[PDB]
Design a protein around this ligand. Structure first.
Ligand SMILES: Nc1nc2c(ncn2[C@@H]2O[C@H](COP(=O)(O)O)[C@@H](O)[C@H]2O)c(=O)[nH]1
Ligand SMILES: Nc1nc2c(ncn2[C@@H]2O[C@H](COP(=O)(O)O)[C@@H](O)[C@H]2O)c(=O)[nH]1
Length: 190
């Protein structure tokens, strides 16, 4: 691997695409963790052979994880953590055991407060249009490097909404680096 994609999701937006059934994210008002994805040559490394998920290894982080890494789609958080470990976390296990991997995600979330970085510049979420350049610029100014924005288009209205924000890190998992990929157009709703 040569880097990490620390992916945070905006719960309400993610759930807005679930036009049927329940979705706990419809009631959250802060960015939460989707995953910490090891990267290599511009691609996400997935399903690397590794240790099976073991909840006991992160028993000391259950408060932080239930708060910062809840499943916004369903009510089983541990299942979500297990899936993220098996599909992504195992790919960085050569240097980060399970305990250190989840602790890394927790620390990253606590040190990358997206709303806190936007609020002062009148860029916080208000259901209205935002500029891709403006949002990335505010985050760059606050954190020092460009984030990767992720948008999704409503199949009905074709309106584009910001759904995730990626913070790119070097292989050391602490040094931020510029992201180089956005799935957002020049403008979107946030
Ligand atoms: N922002 C933030 N809140 C946390 C974190 N860990 C726990 N919390 C929250 O802070 C309060 C105290 O958590 P505790 O210190 O008992 O683990 C709870 O309301 C809990 O949801 C964390 O790492 N960051
Ligand atoms: N994006 C996302 N997927 C979730 C969440 N809770 C559970 N999941 C499950 O995790 C899968 C995501 O896999 P990933 O894209 O991280 O490899 C989804 O297909 C879904 O079944 C959540 O809050 N966000």
């Amino acid at each position: 691997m040569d880097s990490f994609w620390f992916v945070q999701q905006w719960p309400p937006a993610v759930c807005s695409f679930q036009k049927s059934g329940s979705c706990p994210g419809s009631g959250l008002r802060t960015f939460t963790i989707h995953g910490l994805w090891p990267q290599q040559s511009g691609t996400s490394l997935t399903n690397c052979p590794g240790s099976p998920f073991d909840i006991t290894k992160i028993s000391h982080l259950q408060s932080q994880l239930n708060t910062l890494w809840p499943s916004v789609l369903r009510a089983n958080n541990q299942q979500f953590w297990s899936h993220e470990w098996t599909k992504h976390g195992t790919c960085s296990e050569s240097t980060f055991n399970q305990a250190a991997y989840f602790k890394l995600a927790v620390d990253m979330r606590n040190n990358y407060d997206i709303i806190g970085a936007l609020r002062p510049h009148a860029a916080g979420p208000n259901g209205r249009t935002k500029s891709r350049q403006a949002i990335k610029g505010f985050l760059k100014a606050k954190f020092g490097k460009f984030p990767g924005l992720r948008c999704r288009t409503d199949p009905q209205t074709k309106v584009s909404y910001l759904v995730e924000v990626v913070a790119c890190f070097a292989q050391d998992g602490s040094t931020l680096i510029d992201c180089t990929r956005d799935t957002c157009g020049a403008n979107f709703i946030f």
